[PDB]
Enzyme design. Structure first.
Site, mmCIF file in Angstrom:
data_model
loop_
_atom_site.group_PDB
_atom_site.id
_atom_site.type_symbol
_atom_site.label_atom_id
_atom_site.label_comp_id
_atom_site.label_asym_id
_atom_site.label_seq_id
_atom_site.Cartn_x
_atom_site.Cartn_y
_atom_site.Cartn_z
ATOM 1 N N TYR A 164 -3.269 4.433 -6.751
ATOM 2 C CA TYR A 164 -3.216 3.138 -6.130
ATOM 3 C C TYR A 164 -4.599 2.784 -5.651
ATOM 4 O O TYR A 164 -5.334 3.647 -5.182
ATOM 5 C CB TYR A 164 -2.289 3.128 -4.926
ATOM 6 N N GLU B 298 4.977 -8.606 2.549
ATOM 7 C CA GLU B 298 4.732 -9.211 1.243
ATOM 8 C C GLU B 298 5.676 -10.346 0.933
ATOM 9 O O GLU B 298 6.752 -10.453 1.517
ATOM 10 C CB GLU B 298 4.874 -8.149 0.159
#
Lengths: 162, 162
Positions: free
Chosen positions: A20, A65
């Site tokens: 990531y 998000e």
């Protein structure tokens, strides 16, 4: 210090090898890009975040998000380790590919999906990872994360060839 | 160390004076009790949590709630400070009193509410607080948080009179 943390461009690697990538673009914004795993291909620019220094050598970066996912990460730069917990709505776990896109250009799809599909029970993933790449790219460097991941890109980032 | 962190019974106090109480009952469980503010009166037993040691002197306690709320706390015991971020569904911010109860006996109401009312946009609250009371109560002490908050209770906890 915080001045050193802001601007950090990192790759971190989980025990399963998933990579990531995050860029601490300024004191309230990240970009990120996921190279492996459940949502490989996902990338996000201009995500508003809370960034705090908890104590010397320990930072916290947290946000929600458009999909509903909540994230709270800690970075320990001197120990080259991070910890994250991600609280995914059920639908993101069941339909991860919806989230695999340049999210900024698909907000309406994220919002449609978070209302269409089930949220609960959440899929909650706490895990440490090793920080396996770090370079300070300065503040508001818009070139760091500006396209989707591609084959071998993490090697190219670590080689400094981009 | 982690052995010292587990068992911690704390009150922490926000800048506005709100007092929140937590008991790290074992390495994967908390009880908590809120004495002030938006959800004063709320208390929870046997909440499953992720607890990790990030580095010396820094712990992280994180979980999701039956209401949908996600929480990630950090404690820095030696500095008597904590940081938390709470990601509330919109409905918890708009209907906080639904959540003001002994949650364990009202799970069905939490689940009804999280489906009935809107989740988005979330109300996200990151904030530091001062740890203003700490006592280790041992592991699996079922008496620490076993009834609702009442007037003056935090004084009684700090006085050790209970």
């Amino acid at each position: 210090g915080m001045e050193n943390f802001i601007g950090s461009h990192m790759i971190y690697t989980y025990e399963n090898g998933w990579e990531y990538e995050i860029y601490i673009k300024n004191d309230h914004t990240i970009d990120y890009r996921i190279h492996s795993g459940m949502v490989a291909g996902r990338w996000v620019r201009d995500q508003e975040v809370n960034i705090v220094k908890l104590t010397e050598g320990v930072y916290k970066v947290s946000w929600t998000e458009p999909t509903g996912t909540d994230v709270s990460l800690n970075f320990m730069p001197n120990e080259k380790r991070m910890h994250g917990i991600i609280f995914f709505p059920k639908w993101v776990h069941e339909h991860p590919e919806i989230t695999v896109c340049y999210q900024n250009d698909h907000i309406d799809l994220m919002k449609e999906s978070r209302e269409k599909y089930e949220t609960y029970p959440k899929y909650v993933v706490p895990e440490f990872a090793e920080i396996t790449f770090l370079k300070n790219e300065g503040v508001d460097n818009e070139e760091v994360i500006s396209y989707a991941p591609y084959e071998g890109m993490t090697d190219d980032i670590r080689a400094g060839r981009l």
